[PDB]
Design a protein around this ligand. Structure first.
Ligand SMILES: Cc1cc2c(cc1N1C(=O)c3cccc4cccc(c34)C1=O)n(C)c(=O)n2C
Length: 114
């Protein structure tokens, strides 16, 4: 029965995550930060996250509520604004994703509370 309720949540979160990825047309956040390109990344960042990793979790009914999903979105953003300096294409992409994504998530919070 929980999974019946949770099936509806998934559907809504799928749509939210699609909208979020559209706010990253550079695909900067679409997969794990490459450890080939950034061999020291896990020394800096203890909990990596990216949209593909969210999508896996989503499709395994791994998000039991919207807050768990927003936590992983926030990890993408916060990890990026820690690792990268402010003038970089990465930090600026994180700011735009945070700003544009917040609009999407504020509407999502309303639809969940229904
Ligand atoms: C290369 C890289 C470094 C990143 C970073 C993302 C990338 N990066 C990839 O690792 C990558 C892997 C595979 C395909 C890709 C396609 C487009 C862009 C990236 C990409 C990308 O920016 N983020 C979010 C960071 O904070 N850093 C330091």
């Amino acid at each position: 029965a929980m999974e019946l309720r949770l099936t509806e949540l998934t559907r809504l979160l799928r749509s939210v995550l699609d909208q979020l990825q559209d706010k990253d047309p550079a695909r900067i956040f679409a997969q794990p930060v490459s450890l080939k390109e950034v061999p020291d990344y896990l020394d800096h960042i203890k909990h990596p996250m990216d949209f593909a990793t969210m999508r896996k979790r989503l499709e395994a009914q791994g998000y039991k509520n919207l807050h768990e999903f927003e936590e992983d979105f926030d990890l993408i953003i916060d990890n990026c604004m820690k690792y990268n300096a402010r003038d970089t294409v990465f930090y600026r992409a994180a700011v735009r994703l945070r700003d544009q994504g917040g609009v999407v998530l504020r509407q999502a919070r309303r639809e969940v509370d229904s």
